[PDB]
Structure 1
Amino acid sequence: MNPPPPETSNPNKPKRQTNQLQYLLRVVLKTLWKHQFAWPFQQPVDAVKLNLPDYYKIIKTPMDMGTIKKRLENNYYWNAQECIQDFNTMFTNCYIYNKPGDDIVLMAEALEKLFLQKINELPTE
């Protein structure tokens, strides 16, 4: 069964736009999104659809690129580091839930390397 997906707005939380956050949407997210291995990560895990009934029994901080994209579009983040942490949670969740060598893990590993390449250099203020 599915929990509610992660919030993409929160009126208590202050919003911000920065050059680095703009870059994380326009270049980092939008490039990863087109990668051949992006599809498992483009939306919250649907434990019923994907027949992973234990997914949210194991993963307690779910994250996915659909959520990240919406957060960036909504100026939900205060800074780039917060957004980068969401990407890192997404990757680490995949490694936690699965096992080394699994096809889905090979997919996450290729995306993570590409992500690291793209955030190696970020715009300045």
Structure 2
Amino acid sequence: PGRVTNQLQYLHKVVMKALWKHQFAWPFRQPVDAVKLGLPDYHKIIKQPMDMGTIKRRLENNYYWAASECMQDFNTMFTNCYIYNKPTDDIVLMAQTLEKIFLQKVASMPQEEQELVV
């Protein structure tokens, strides 16, 4: 059972809003389907797949207990990409651009996490 916090609210309504509509977002909006994309050994290499669609649903459904967990899912999504792919690949450059934006927005997130009731 997760909860609503000021930081999670910010991650939803400011961070995810900036990322979801970005030019480079579309390949990250749903899980990597390795077989359709012809990606060998994707599930040997990546044991914790993650994508922005899953994160967005989790934010919408109060899945997270704390913003740190949501930020961990973002980090996992980006590092999965960096690990599976080559440093010069289009998808890695796209991920780097998205992560730069994510981290920039995190620098203006509310500082002290407090739960919101109603």
Q: 1:38 and 1:56 mapped to 2: Cα distance? A: 22
Runs of 4+ residues over 2 Å off in structure 1:
none
Q: 1:36 and 1:17 mapped to 2: Cα distance? A: 29
Task: State which drifts further: 46-55 or 72-81.
Answer: 46-55
Partner of 2:79: 92
Partner of 2:19: 32
Q: Could you tell me the TM-score, scaled by structure 1's length?
A: 0.85
Q: 1:121 and 1:27 mapped to 2: Cα distance? A: 10
Partner of 1:103: 90
Q: Which gives a bigger RCO, structure 1 or 2 (Cα 8 Å, sep 6+)?
A: 2
Q: 1:26 and 1:88 mapped to 2: Cα distance? A: 18
Flag structure 2 segments of 5+ consecutive residues without an equivalent: none
- Within 5 Å, give how 1:11-50 maps onto structure 2: 14-50=1-37
C-alpha offsets along residues 27-52 of structure 1, whole Å, 9 cap, x if unaligned? 10121011111111100111122222
- Quick one: which of 38, 47, 53 aligns to 1:60? 47
Partner of 1:120: 107
Q: Could you tell me the TM-score, scaled by structure 2's length?
A: 0.90
- Provide the secondary structure at the position in 2 that maps to 1:117: helix
Task: Give the superposition deviation at 1:53.
Answer: 3.7
Aligned length: 112
Q: 2:21 and 2:59 mapped to 1: Cα distance? A: 17
What is the RMSD computed on CA atoms of the aligned residues?
Answer: 1.1
Q: 2:92 and 2:79 mapped to 1: Cα distance? A: 10
Partner of 1:10: none
Does 2:61 align with 1:74? yes
